[PDB]
């Protein structure tokens, strides 16, 4: 079982002041552990997760200091980005940051992430080597030269290779029962008539963790990954996920179609069929 | 743990 930590931060400009809203969300694989909000009073929902409050007040005060530092840095970033695209104070914009680490079964780093985005589009991204950057536009080039002179990559590599890996392995040990767990899906196939000549076969998956699963419909053992109506992995209000896959079938040819289910929480991949 | 982001864009 491989593991990964990822932080999702947003900076929101307003037409009154290009700062008001700042959100920082921490995730281990698919479960949330930390949430920082500027609009939250004062903040009361701090600490948040149960296995995070085991750490002393020195842990929380540090992460509150990090957020406060980041919010003032984001305010400066929101001003600088406006000048690059020649935007006005009347406009409300969104800056997004996505940083984290990827570890294997042992606990060693594989991929280091530090990605940025302005108004939904990719801005600047840290390369796999952790020494070079990737600019996604003309204005992103001027941030790259600003950052390579400031040697930002050196410190970013140091956080990902060190602090990130160190904390993720500690986070795993503190609550193995809540993170290392792998729940299998409650699978069943349903039939829908719709037409006299056509019919719909839907493959279901419920109460699984993590969200990362594979559902594929196939007739005569050959993959039908074209006529498949695959719906996005939707979550449930109890740390579980749901996902379904449908396929258009001619009448009488129901038994030709078979579905394959692949998940970490499964011992052997399921090969479902329409039974009644 | 939260990463210290001190360098503005």
């Amino acid at each position: 079982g491989s593991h990964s930590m990822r932080y999702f931060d947003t900076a929101m400009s307003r037409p009154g002041r290009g700062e008001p809203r700042f959100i920082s969300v921490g995730y281990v694989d698919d479960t949330q552990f930390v949430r920082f909000d500027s609009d939250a009073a004062s903040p009361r929902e701090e600490p948040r997760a149960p296995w995070i409050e085991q750490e002393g007040p020195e842990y929380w005060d540090r992460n509150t200091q990090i957020f406060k530092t980041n919010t003032q840095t984001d305010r400066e970033s929101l001003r600088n980005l406006r000048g690059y695209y020649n935007q006005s104070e009347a406009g409300s914009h969104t800056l997004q940051s996505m940083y984290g680490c990827d570890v294997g079964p042992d606990g060693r780093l594989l991929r280091g992430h530090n990605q940025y985005a302005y108004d939904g589009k990719d801005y600047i991204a840290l390369n796999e080597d952790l020494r070079s950057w990737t600019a996604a536009d003309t204005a992103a080039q001027i941030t790259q030269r600003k950052w390579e002179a400031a040697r930002v990559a050196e410190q970013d590599r140091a956080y990902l290779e060190g602090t990130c890996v160190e904390w993720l392995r500690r986070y795993l040990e503190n609550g193995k029962d809540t993170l290392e767990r792998a729940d299998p899906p409650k699978t069943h196939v349903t039939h829908h008539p719709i037409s006299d000549h056509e019919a719909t076969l839907r493959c279901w998956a419920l109460g699984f963790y993590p969200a990362e699963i594979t559902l594929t419909w196939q007739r005569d053992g050959e993959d039908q990954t074209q006529d498949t109506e695959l719906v996005e992995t939707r979550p449930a209000g109890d740390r579980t996920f749901q996902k379904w896959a449908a396929v258009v079938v001619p009448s009488g040819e129901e038994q030709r179609y078979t579905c394959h289910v692949q998940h970490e929480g499964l011992p052997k991949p399921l090969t479902l069929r329409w039974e009644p | 743990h939260s990463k210290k982001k001190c360098d503005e864009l």
Epitope: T69, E154, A158, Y159 | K3
Partner: T-cell receptor, first 114, second 112 residues
Framework: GVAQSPRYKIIEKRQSVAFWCNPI?????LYWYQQILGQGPKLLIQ????????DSQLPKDRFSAERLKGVDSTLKIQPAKLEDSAVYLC?????????????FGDGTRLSILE | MGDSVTQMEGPVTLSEEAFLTINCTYT??????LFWYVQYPGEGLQLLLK?????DKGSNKGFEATYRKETTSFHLEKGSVQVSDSAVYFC??????????FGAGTRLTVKP
């Protein structure tokens, strides 16, 4: 270099005192320290631009600090006590940033008299 | 996290041209940056030398302190100590997530 004013100040018990500081041009982060006459520096309040990052060590009852326009800062002591007699240091960092060192001022020697 | 720095106890008294060694040990998780600060009588604190990356040298005006990840130490050394070196020295510790922390301070007194 980091500028601090005054260099020395004489104040009586329960009287108010103000300490001014200006960092190195461009330095986004500022730090206010207390160095008790014969020991190491202890952090009071830390700023990143105009906003406060840490103030857990700052005793709110007497102490206060402002960096309203993200450049120069003003550390103020309300009804001062005899234990506050120390050298008030002030440092700054470019972005700070663990790899970046802090640059200290010449400090302000405060003597609280009966 | 960590995060503590311990500096050598009491005042160090030496003779001029003698070898100097000021001990410093730290507890930090990850890759921290290490510093030495010097406070000459009257004046405030001033950076002496720094070592950020693992196995970084870091040296100024005869002083030396190598960052050794394996032993977790940052000892200040000088071959020929001078009378002008009589001051209070401070070791500093900071990592990517932790702000700079200072040691108690070792006072050096060089006799001619």
């Amino acid at each position: 270099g980091v500028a601090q004013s005054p260099r020395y100040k004489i104040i009586e018990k329960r009287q108010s005192v103000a300490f001014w500081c200006n960092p190195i041009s461009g330095h986004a982060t500022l730090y206010w320290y207390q160095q008790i006459l014969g020991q190491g520096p202890k952090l009071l309040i830390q700023f990143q631009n105009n906003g406060v990052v840490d103030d857990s060590q700052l005793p709110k009852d007497r102490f206060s600090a402002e960096r309203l326009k993200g450049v120069d800062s003003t550390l103020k002591i309300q009804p001062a006590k005899l234990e506050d007699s120390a050298v008030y240091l002030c440092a700054s960092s470019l972005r700070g940033r663990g790899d970046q060192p802090q640059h200290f001022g010449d400090g302000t020697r405060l003597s609280i008299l009966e | 996290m960590g995060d503590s720095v311990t500096q050598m106890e009491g005042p160090v008294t030496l003779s001029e041209e003698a070898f100097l060694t000021i001990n410093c040990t730290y507890t930090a998780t990850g890759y921290p940056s290490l510093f030495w600060y010097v406070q000459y009588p009257g004046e405030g604190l001033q950076l002496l030398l720094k070592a950020t990356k693992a196995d970084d040298k870091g040296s100024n005006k005869g002083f030396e302190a190598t960052y050794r990840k394996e032993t977790t130490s940052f000892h200040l050394e000088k071959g020929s100590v001078q009378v002008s070196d009589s001051a209070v020295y401070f070791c500093a510790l900071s990592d990517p997530v932790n702000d700079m922390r200072f040691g108690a301070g070792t006072r050096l007194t060089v006799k001619p």
